[PDB]
Amino acid sequence: GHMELKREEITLLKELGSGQFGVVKLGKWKGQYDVAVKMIKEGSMSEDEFFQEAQTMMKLSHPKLVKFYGVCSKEYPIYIVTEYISNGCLLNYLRSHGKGLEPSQLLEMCYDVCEGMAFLESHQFIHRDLAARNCLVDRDLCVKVSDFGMTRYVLDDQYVSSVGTKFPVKWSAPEVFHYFKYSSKSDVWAFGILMWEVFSLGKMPYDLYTNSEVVLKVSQGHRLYRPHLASDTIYQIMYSCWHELPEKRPTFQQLLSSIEPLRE
Numbered sequence: 195g196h197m198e199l200k201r202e203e204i205t206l207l208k209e210l211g212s213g214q215f216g217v218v219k220l221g222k223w224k225g226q227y228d229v230a231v232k233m234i235k236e237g238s239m240s241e242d243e244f245f246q247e248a249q250t251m252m253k254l255s256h257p258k259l260v261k262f263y264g265v266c267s268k269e270y271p272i273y274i275v276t277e278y279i280s281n282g283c284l285l286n287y288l289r290s291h292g293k294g295l296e297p298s299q300l301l302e303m304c305y306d307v308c309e310g311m312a313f314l315e316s317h318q319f320i321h322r323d324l325a326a327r328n329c330l331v332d333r334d335l336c337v338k339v340s341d342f343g344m345t346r347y348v349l350d351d352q353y354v355s356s357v358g359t360k361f362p363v364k365w366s367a368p369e370v371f372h373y374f375k376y377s378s379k380s381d382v383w384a385f386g387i388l389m390w391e392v393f394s395l396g397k398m399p400y401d402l403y404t405n406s407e408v409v410l411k412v413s414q415g416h417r418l419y420r421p422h423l424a425s426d427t428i429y430q431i432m433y434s435c436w437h438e439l440p441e442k443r444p445t446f447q448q449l450l451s452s453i454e455p456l457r458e
């Protein structure tokens with residue numbers, strides 16, 4: 195229906211990079227709009243998994259989530275057409291341009307992600323890999339969360355199996371790495387790690403340690419230290435995301451309103 199786009203109305207231009215689940219190309223849609231098109235190869239992911247994903251992305255429209263326009267699914271490679279977010283990946287942006295940012299700009303990046311995540315949370319979805327590598331930066335430095343192939347339906351205070359794509363353990367809550375289960379607060383833990391990445395200008399978390407070491411250290415109570423550019427108030431907010439128990443972590447709704455008075 196409205197989800198299907200006219201393939202002849204998409205012209206692909208240069209490769210932008212890769213992520214997911216697929217190479218991403220810059221494109222033009224209807225000879226007017228700049229788009230980023232993800233290529234879904236035949237066999238790369240399931241046919242029926244694709245429909246559920248495309249529908250979920252279409253449903254979840256928010257200014258802080260990558261805008262989905264439609265798909266070209268009649269032939270392979272399947273196109274996933276989205277808005278082109280000109281400054282690309284947040285992680286690369288922090289690494290290349292982070293020194294030029296004010297701490298108030300770093301907080302605004304965290305606020306943007308939180309606002310998009312509060313929207314997902316209000317719809318009973320979690321993000322399975324909330325990290326700077328899955329966020330994009332637009333021309334005005336507004337941050338958008340990329341959620342394709344990385345969401346999971348979970349009712350509040352309930353647990354669901356972690357079975358599927360194994361995402362980086364340094365962004366994983368203990369219920370994930372220990373019990374192979376997601377809670378409605380598993381992405382809140384990841385969001386605290388994302389705030390740490392932002393305020394650290396894209397440094398790797400626990401950079402001295404292997405994944406095996408991190409699982410042990412985190413189980414023992416060890417946490418990431420305060421990034422130099424983070425105020426103690428901002429550190430207390432990220433730190434609150436890392437309670438061993440999901441019940442003790444804030445929701446994104448609480449995080450959002452905690453960040454709101456600290457802006458500019």
Ligand SMILES: CC(C)(C)n1[nH+]c(-c2ccc(Cl)cc2)c2c(N)ncnc21
Nearest residue numbers: 210211212213230232274278279283342
């Ligand atoms: C990887 C990188 C940074 C080149 N990348 N990836 C996406 C993107 C496109 C479609 C989907 Cl479905 C998900 C993400 C993207 C975008 N929209 N704008 C700019 N860079 C993008």
